[PDB]
Amino acid sequence: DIRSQSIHFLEQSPSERLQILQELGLGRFKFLSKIRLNDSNVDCVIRFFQNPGQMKFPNLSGADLSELNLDEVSLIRGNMSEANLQGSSLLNADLIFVNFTKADLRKADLRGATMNGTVWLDTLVDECQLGIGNGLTKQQRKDLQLRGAEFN
């Protein structure tokens, strides 16, 4: 009666989803109106439901977010570890303190995104575009370009 709440949510169109989100105070987390129905995201969504806004730091750990347009999304202090972001657009996103540990960001687009505090342990970054590197240490900027990422 809870796995069901989530499956039912993920079966809805994006604007019906936003409707549900607002009748729950999760109107912050609009990117939830976009994620696709599949095994990983039913799980990720069950976290957001049980104890709603009893978390308020975005935990998208292990979620499938590939090929999404997440431009200008704010994910401050969010956990994206073991998450799939292949091909997604994160233009001008707020990614301060985001944990990217063991995440897949190949071909993702982070141009203009603010990245102070980000952790990139084991992260797959081949062809990840990073633009300026806004907020990364100049060693971080080195390690990441060695690992496939692309700047300016």
Residue extents of the structural domains in the chain: 1-152
For residue 71, which phi and psi values (nearest 5 degrees)? -55, 135
- Experimental approach taken: X-ray
> What tokens were used for 67?
């090929």
Say if residues 151 and 145 touch (Cβ distance below 8 Å): yes
Cα separation, 46 vs 52, whole angstroms: 10
Cα separation, 53 vs 67, whole angstroms: 26
The CB density around residue 119, as the number of other CB atoms within 10 Å, is 16
Please enumerate in sequence order all residues whose Cβ is within 8 A of that of 133, keeping only pairs 6 or more positions apart, or say none: 115, 140, 141, 144, 151
Four-point Cα dihedral 91, 92, 96, 102, nearest 10: 10
Q: In one letter, which amino acid is 5?
A: Q
> What tokens were used for 60?
């998208």
Q: Is 51 exposed, middle or buried (0-12, 13-18, 19+ CB in 10 A)?
A: exposed
Resolution value, angstrom units: 2.3
> What tokens were used for 52?
């709603």
